Amino acid sequence: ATFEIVNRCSYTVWAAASKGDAALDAGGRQLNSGESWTINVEPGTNGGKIWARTDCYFDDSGSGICKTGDCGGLLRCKRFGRPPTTLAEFSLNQYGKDYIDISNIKGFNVPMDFSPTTRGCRGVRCAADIVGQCPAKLKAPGGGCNDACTVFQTSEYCCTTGKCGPTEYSRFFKRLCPDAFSYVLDKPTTVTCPGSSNYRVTFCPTA
Numbered sequence: 001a002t003f004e005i006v007n008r009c010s011y012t013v014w015a016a017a018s019k020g021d022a023a024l025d026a027g028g029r030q031l032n033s034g035e036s037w038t039i040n041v042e043p044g045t046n047g048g049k050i051w052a053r054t055d056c057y058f059d060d061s062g063s064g065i066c067k068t069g070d071c072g073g074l075l076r077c078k079r080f081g082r083p084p085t086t087l088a089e090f091s092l093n094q095y096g097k098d099y100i101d102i103s104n105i106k107g108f109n110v111p112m113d114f115s116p117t118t119r120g121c122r123g124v125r126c127a128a129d130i131v132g133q134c135p136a137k138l139k140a141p142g143g144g145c146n147d148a149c150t151v152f153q154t155s156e157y158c159c160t161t162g163k164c165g166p167t168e169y170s171r172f173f174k175r176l177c178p179d180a181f182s183y184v185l186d187k188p189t190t191v192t193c194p195g196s197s198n199y200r201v202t203f204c205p206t207a
Contacts, residue, residue, distance in 0.1 A: 001040070001041050001043065001045075001092055001098075001196060001197065001198055001199065002038055002039070002040055002041075002198045002199070003017075003038070003039050003040075003041060003050065003198070003199045003200070003201060004036055004037075004038050004117065004198075004199070004200040004201070005017075005031070005036065005037045005038070005039065005050065005200075005201045005202075005203075006031075006035075006036045006200060006201070006202045006203070007031035007032065007033060007034065007035050007036070007202075007203050007204075008033075008034070008202055008203060008204040008205060009033060009110065009203050009204035010033050010204070011033065011054070012030060012031065012032050012033065013030075013031050013052040013053065013054060013110065013203055014028060014029065014030050014031070014052070014053040014054075014056045014058075014066065014069075014075065015028060015029055015030075015031050015037055015050065015051075015052060015053075015203075016028045016050065016051050016052070016053055016069060016071055016077040016081055017039060017041075017048070017049070017050045017077065018048070018049055018071065018077050018078060018079060018080055018081075019045055019046070019047055019048045019049070020047055020049075020079065020080055021078070021079070022078055023076060023077055023078045024039060024041050024042075024045065024048055024050075025039035025040055025041065026039070026076055027074075027075075027076040027077040027078055028053075028071075028074070028075050028076045028077045029075075029076075030075075031203075041092065042092075043092055043093045043196060044092055044093045044094075045090070045091065045092045045093075046091045046092070046094065047089075047091060048089070048090050048091070048092070049080060049087050049088065049089050049090075050087075050088040050090075050201050051069050051081055051085045051086065051087050051088065051109075052068075052069060052085070052086070052109060052110040052112075052203050053066040053067075053068060053069035053070065053071075053081065053085075054066065054067050054068045054069070054109060054110065054143055054144075055067035055068075055143065056070075056075075058075045062074060062075035062076060063075075066081075067142045067143050068081075068082075068084055068085060068109040068110075068140070068142060068143050068144045069081035069082065069085040069109060070082045083106040083107045083144075083146060083147060083150045084106060084107025084108055084109050084140050084144035084145055084146045084147070084150070085106050085107060085108075085109050085144070086102065086103075086104065086107075086108050086109055086110055086111065086112045086126060086180075087102065087103045087104075087105070087106060088100070088101075088102055088112060088114040088201045089101050089102070089103050090114075090199070092195075092196070093195045093196060096195045097192050097193065097194070097195055098192070098193040098194065098195055098196070098197050099190050099191070099192060099193070100114055100116075100124065100190065100191050100193060100199070101114075101124060101180070101181060101188075101189060101190045101191065102114050102124045102125070102126045102177075102179065102180045102181070102189075103180055103181040104126065104130075104147065104173040104177055104180045104181060104182055105147055105149075105181050105182070105183060105184060106147055106150070107138070107140070107144055107145050107146045107147045107150065108126075108130040108131065108134075108144060108145045108173070108177075109131070109143065109144035109145075110203050110204065111126060111127040111128065111129075111130075111203070111204055111205065111206070112125070112126055112127070112201060112202065112203055112205070113125045113126075113127065113200075113201070113202040113205035114199065114200075114201050114202075115199065115200050115202075116193050116197045116198065116199055117197075117198045117199060117200050118193075118194070118197045118198050119194075120193065120194050120197070121191055121192065121193040121194070121197070122191060123191070124179045124180070124189065124191060125179060125205060126177035126179060126180040127204075127205050127206045128176040128177055129176075130145050130173070130176050130177065131143070131144060131145055133172075133176065134172075135169070135172055137151060138151060138169065138172075147169070147173075147183075148167060148169035148170065157169070157183075158184075159183065159184035159185055162185075164183065164184065164185055165185070166182070166183060166186075167183065170182040170183040170186070174186070
């Protein structure tokens with residue numbers, strides 16, 4: 001499947017794509033304001049994620065640091081990124097279908113839209129200004145809005161036991177981005193697409 005990744009933010013981002021233990025395609029790339037990166041992702045990719053990293057410095061060997069979404073200091077990512085990060089999440093060709101969603105479970109750094117470019121399903125969007133409205137205790141000094149599990153590390157936030165409910169903090173994400181997952185056991189907002197669809201992820205989809 002092809003994913004077109006588009007940067008519509010006014011600042012540079014470093015896109016990242018990974019399935020947790022390996023990179024998807026080159027795994028990562030600078031995208032200036034307006035730029036697009038098309039990647040190819042193996043069919044049957046399960047648990048893929050694409051996200052944005054902000055304020056990064058890399059050297060010529062491609063090692064460095066990012067203010068949000070840093071995946072072990074590498075330009076070309078192979079593991080998941082350090083929160084806070086809005087996540088486009090997907091699983092391809094799973095008994096005939098594709099499954100996509102956007103998640104705030106690891107916080108929020110950049111607004112995002114995640115849409116099929118082929119026919120037969122809808123996209124999802126989480127474009128609201130969460131960083132500006134973030135409750136004091138979730139503000140990341142580094143930029144972005146952390147999720148409550150990252151800040152507080154309790155069973156109730158992390159849904160360690162599998163019995164958690166919504167919390168004051170998850171209700172803030174849900175109120176601002178009703179189409180994204182706000183905590184683990186949130187009522188699913190996954191979209192089912194035909195097997196083998198293609199996709200666009202857009203950072204800052206709105207003006």
